[PDB]
Amino acid sequence: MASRILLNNGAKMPILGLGTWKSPPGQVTEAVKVAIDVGYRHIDCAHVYQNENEVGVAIQEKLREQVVKREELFIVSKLWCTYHEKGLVKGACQKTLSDLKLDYLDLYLIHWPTGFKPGKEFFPLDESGNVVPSDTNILDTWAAMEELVDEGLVKAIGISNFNHLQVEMILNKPGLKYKPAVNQIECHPYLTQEKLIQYCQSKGIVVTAYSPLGSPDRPWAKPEDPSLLEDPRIKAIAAKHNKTTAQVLIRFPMQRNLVVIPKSVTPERIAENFKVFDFELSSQDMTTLLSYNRNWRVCALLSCTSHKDYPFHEEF
Numbered sequence: 001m002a003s004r005i006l007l008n009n010g011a012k013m014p015i016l017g018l019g020t021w022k023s024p025p026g027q028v029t030e031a032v033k034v035a036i037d038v039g040y041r042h043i044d045c046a047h048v049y050q051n052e053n054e055v056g057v058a059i060q061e062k063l064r065e066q067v068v069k070r071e072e073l074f075i076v077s078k079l080w081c082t083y084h085e086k087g088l089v090k091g092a093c094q095k096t097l098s099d100l101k102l103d104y105l106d107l108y109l110i111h112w113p114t115g116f117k118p119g120k121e122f123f124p125l126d127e128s129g130n131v132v133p134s135d136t137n138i139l140d141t142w143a144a145m146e147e148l149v150d151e152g153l154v155k156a157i158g159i160s161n162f163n164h165l166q167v168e169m170i171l172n173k174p175g176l177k178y179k180p181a182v183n184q185i186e187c188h189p190y191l192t193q194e195k196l197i198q199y200c201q202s203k204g205i206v207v208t209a210y211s212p213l214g215s216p217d218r219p220w221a222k223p224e225d226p227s228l229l230e231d232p233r234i235k236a237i238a239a240k241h242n243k244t245t246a247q248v249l250i251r252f253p254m255q256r257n258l259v260v261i262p263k264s265v266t267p268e269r270i271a272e273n274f275k276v277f278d279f280e281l282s283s284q285d286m287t288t289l290l291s292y293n294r295n296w297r298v299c300a301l302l303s304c305t306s307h308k309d310y311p312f313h314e315e316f
Ligand SMILES: NC(=O)c1ccc[n+]([C@@H]2O[C@H](COP(=O)([O-])OP(=O)(O)OC[C@H]3O[C@@H](n4cnc5c(N)ncnc54)[C@H](OP(=O)(O)O)[C@@H]3O)[C@@H](O)[C@H]2O)c1
Pocket: 018, 019, 020, 021, 022, 044, 045, 111, 160, 161, 184, 185, 209, 210, 211, 212, 213, 214, 215, 216, 217, 218, 229, 244, 246, 247, 261, 262, 263, 264, 265, 266, 269, 270, 272, 273, 298, 299
């Protein structure tokens, strides 16, 4: 297992990164510092997480301390829905750069295919709780992303939560200048994504798997939900390999040629989650884990299900 994967922009991306959604701002600086100390070279960020300043403090300290060189880091962020208007994209990117204390991002993603009305609120609502859409075509948002590459603000651009038809729409964009480098999507044994993954990979788009542990700290968890970390079938595979269940859940996407971004603010878990380059799952293990698919999603919002670009009506 090599540590990086080659992107279609010619750059190499570390296959293991640290997630930061829900990482408390008064814990995430230490989390990122520890992560870098124990080997992480890829951090997954977003403006909507409201903690980029604090992530940036950690990155900057480790750069200043000469623990790692900037060229060795791979920092990812995402354009939030309320900034899909072409005239807002640069400012959104620059705010993220300022907070992260960087002069470029390695990868900048359209966070969701759904554009929302611009304003202070991240989810602008009408009086019934439907999100208020923007009419900016995603192809136009893509053109604005391409400009960021041409201005030196980002080395690569990509997409997140795009379904197969939406990926195809970008790939078929009239006058397309840069293909997406990455599609970042939810992926784990309960949402295995075979069709979408094969399609993206076939087009040279690298897939990043989010919520690989099933996001046990997600705000809307319910007792009746399935639980990857507690599934005795997965625990059994872990026990056989003398690894933790989390380690199996992280190794799984790695062996599908995916990038994976487990989140933790717990130092011992941050280290545990990185110790996944010293064992292999068999083909039988892989097929067994794939068999647990049930199309179960951590991330899908009722408020967006009527948006014309809602991604999860389509089979994939
Ligand atoms: N593009 C998108 O729309 C999108 C959507 C969702 C997520 N993401 C990205 O993907 C990242 C990962 O997804 P996620 O945050 O939803 O959930 P996740 O990585 O699947 O799971 C995070 C949860 O697992 C716990 N955990 C971590 N390591 C563990 C271990 N070794 N043993 C037991 N528990 C462990 C964490 O607890 P502690 O932190 O307390 O240690 C936390 O409660 C996000 O942080 C974000 O960067 C992107």
